[PDB]
Symmetry: C3
Subunit: 125 residues, 3 copies
């Protein structure tokens, strides 16, 4: 049972990808960056503001997929500077409650739109 997920409260998938794909109860989430889905530009603000937007964006995809952030089982967090990770960890506390998803945090070189953070993952409802 395969389905493309789209939410108009998450940035439009421009190009050869979908916001997420759902097969039975498992949902594969595309990477989200701090795009404001309205302006299609990065939200303005410090790292924390960008992290907030990434999770708001994922939340909308999760909701469009029939669940919420609580259904995320694995989260990949890509940062241009790992020094920012404690902020990610703390912001996550506002969007997730125990039990938390598995997680991998990696310091990488570049992200789309010069973002400071991109996160993707897997959800199971």
């Amino acid at each position: 049972n395969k389905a493309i997920i789209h939410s108009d409260n998450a940035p439009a998938a421009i190009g050869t990808y979908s916001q997420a794909v759902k097969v039975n109860n498992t949902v594969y989430l595309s990477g989200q960056i701090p795009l404001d889905p309205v302006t299609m530009q990065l939200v303005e603000g410090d790292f924390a503001v960008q992290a907030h937007q990434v999770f708001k964006n994922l939340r909308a995809v999760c909701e469009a997929a029939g669940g919420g952030l609580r259904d995320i089982v694995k989260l990949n967090v890509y940062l241009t500077d790992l020094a920012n990770f404690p902020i990610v960890n703390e912001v996550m506390g506002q969007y997730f409650q125990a039990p938390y998803p598995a997680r991998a945090a990696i310091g990488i070189n570049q992200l789309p739109r010069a973002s400071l953070i991109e996160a993707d993952g897997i959800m199971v409802i």
Copy 2:
């Protein structure tokens, strides 16, 4: 728990301690493919677009060996040494995938196997 090793003679041999892909029930977990020519086991020569084409042909072969095709990929991870190349990736992908497209993530990283410019892995279902 029934673990099937996927192997295609039309994808680069999996050298070392990994398999080209593993199938369990409905899901196929695809290893990262770089722009290796399966016959020579050296990178193809050509511009970035040629590199990306080889990556998709390589993934295609693995998908075919797993009983499907690129259309069955539900998630694709694309790693690039330089994000300036991403438009070309999106253009090249367009020649291999049609709507409905897979979920995707694109990350600018530091190094790839064999100093490749692009590597992609993913997950297939069917």
Copy 3:
């Protein structure tokens, strides 16, 4: 529906993540780095020592999840330097037997605690 994995033989998951999440026989493993679970500092030694510790850590999580490394179907390996990758093949050979998992090997910029290697993955029992 979801079960949280806790192994006291792998580094404690501090903050907003779980060591692993298990749902219907699929286990999503967090990234492990070469932390000694006792000291919560990196093990001392060269790259091979670090790689051993990463796999010991993953194995502990897999065991707490009701399986072992043999049940891993996909492994992501992140290295600060791909020059180290032959050692990864070598070390993995000691921890895994054919049939080997699918794998992606990526050279990245930085890792938690200045680690030289982090690996995460997916296990199916």
